Design an enzyme around this catalytic site. Structure first.
Site, mmCIF file in Angstrom:
data_model
loop_
_atom_site.group_PDB
_atom_site.id
_atom_site.type_symbol
_atom_site.label_atom_id
_atom_site.label_comp_id
_atom_site.label_asym_id
_atom_site.label_seq_id
_atom_site.Cartn_x
_atom_site.Cartn_y
_atom_site.Cartn_z
ATOM 1 N N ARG A 54 0.858 -1.177 0.000
ATOM 2 C CA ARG A 54 0.000 0.000 0.000
ATOM 3 C C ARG A 54 0.896 1.228 0.000
ATOM 4 N NH1 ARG A 54 -3.862 3.085 3.815
ATOM 5 N NH2 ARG A 54 -5.643 3.406 2.413
ATOM 6 N N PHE A 59 1.575 10.582 1.248
ATOM 7 C CA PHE A 59 1.160 10.057 2.540
ATOM 8 C C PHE A 59 2.215 9.087 3.086
ATOM 9 C CE2 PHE A 59 -2.390 7.375 4.759
ATOM 10 C CZ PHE A 59 -1.869 7.704 5.997
ATOM 11 N N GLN A 62 3.550 1.568 2.959
ATOM 12 C CA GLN A 62 3.303 0.557 3.983
ATOM 13 C C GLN A 62 3.716 -0.831 3.498
ATOM 14 O OE1 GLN A 62 -0.586 0.612 5.781
ATOM 15 N NE2 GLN A 62 -0.291 -1.421 6.715
ATOM 16 N N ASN A 101 -1.366 -0.704 12.514
ATOM 17 C CA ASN A 101 -2.107 -1.481 13.492
ATOM 18 C C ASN A 101 -3.582 -1.459 13.150
ATOM 19 O OD1 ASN A 101 -3.563 0.638 14.921
ATOM 20 N ND2 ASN A 101 -1.560 1.266 15.725
ATOM 21 N N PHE A 112 4.849 1.520 8.405
ATOM 22 C CA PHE A 112 4.818 2.446 7.313
ATOM 23 C C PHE A 112 5.948 3.455 7.432
ATOM 24 C CE2 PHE A 112 2.633 6.041 9.489
ATOM 25 C CZ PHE A 112 2.086 5.388 10.566
ATOM 26 N N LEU A 121 -1.807 10.823 13.397
ATOM 27 C CA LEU A 121 -1.497 9.483 13.863
ATOM 28 C C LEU A 121 -0.795 9.490 15.236
ATOM 29 C CD1 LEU A 121 -0.401 7.903 10.475
ATOM 30 C CD2 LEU A 121 -2.661 7.873 11.551
ATOM 31 N N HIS A 125 -0.289 5.448 16.598
ATOM 32 C CA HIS A 125 0.704 4.577 16.003
ATOM 33 C C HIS A 125 2.042 4.866 16.674
ATOM 34 C CE1 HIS A 125 -1.919 3.161 12.726
ATOM 35 N NE2 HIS A 125 -2.525 4.302 13.000
#
EC number: 5.2.1.8
Length: 164
Positions: A54, A59, A62, A101, A112, A121, A125
């Site tokens: 991903r 952004f 991942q 997660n 990521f 986040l 995270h």
């Protein structure tokens, strides 16, 4: 004293380059150790051969789902899941390495690499490292992502391990 690990990245099997990460063992030792060990493969499983499934330009990239290759798998060196160790470190910008997660205390092997500041986040995270060398390689990887995260070429960790 913080460990350094590397990923040698390939694009449809072609070598792209190396990314190396500093792991913040001094602040998140349990989380750093999981990633370190997964990178060396010393437990008999880990990141070598796995993909970045991903990638969303602007952004993050991942990866770490070495069992199911799509975001539904992975496991830690401690069991399928482990706790959020702490939230001392924040998502301050590109290059931040943080755990993916699926809820509180559900860390596995997925992670990521931020390519932007992702402050929303923070506290959700666990940040545990940063790109040391090869952020340009992360930027090159990023170009193979898309809005929905699907990659246009296969982005793999052809090799990985610990440096120094």
């Amino acid at each position: 004293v913080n460990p350094t690990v590397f990923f040698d990245i390939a694009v449809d099997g072609e070598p792209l380059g190396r990314v190396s990460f500093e792991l913040f063992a001094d602040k998140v030792p349990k989380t750093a150790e999981n990633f370190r060990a997964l990178s060396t493969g010393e437990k008999g499983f880990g990141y070598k051969g796995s993909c970045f499934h991903r990638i969303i330009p602007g952004f993050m990239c991942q990866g770490g789902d070495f069992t199911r290759h799509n975001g539904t798998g992975g496991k830690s060196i401690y069991g399928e899941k482990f706790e959020d160790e702490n939230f001392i470190l924040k998502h301050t910008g590109p290059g931040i390495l943080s755990m993916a997660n699926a809820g509180p205390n559900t860390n596995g092997s997925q992670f990521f690499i931020c390519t932007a500041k992702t402050e929303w986040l923070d506290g959700k995270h666990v940040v545990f490292g940063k790109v040391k060398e090869g952020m340009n390689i992360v930027e090159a990887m990023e170009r193979f992502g898309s809005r929905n995260g699907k990659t246009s070429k296969k982005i793999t960790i052809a090799d990985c391990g610990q440096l120094e």
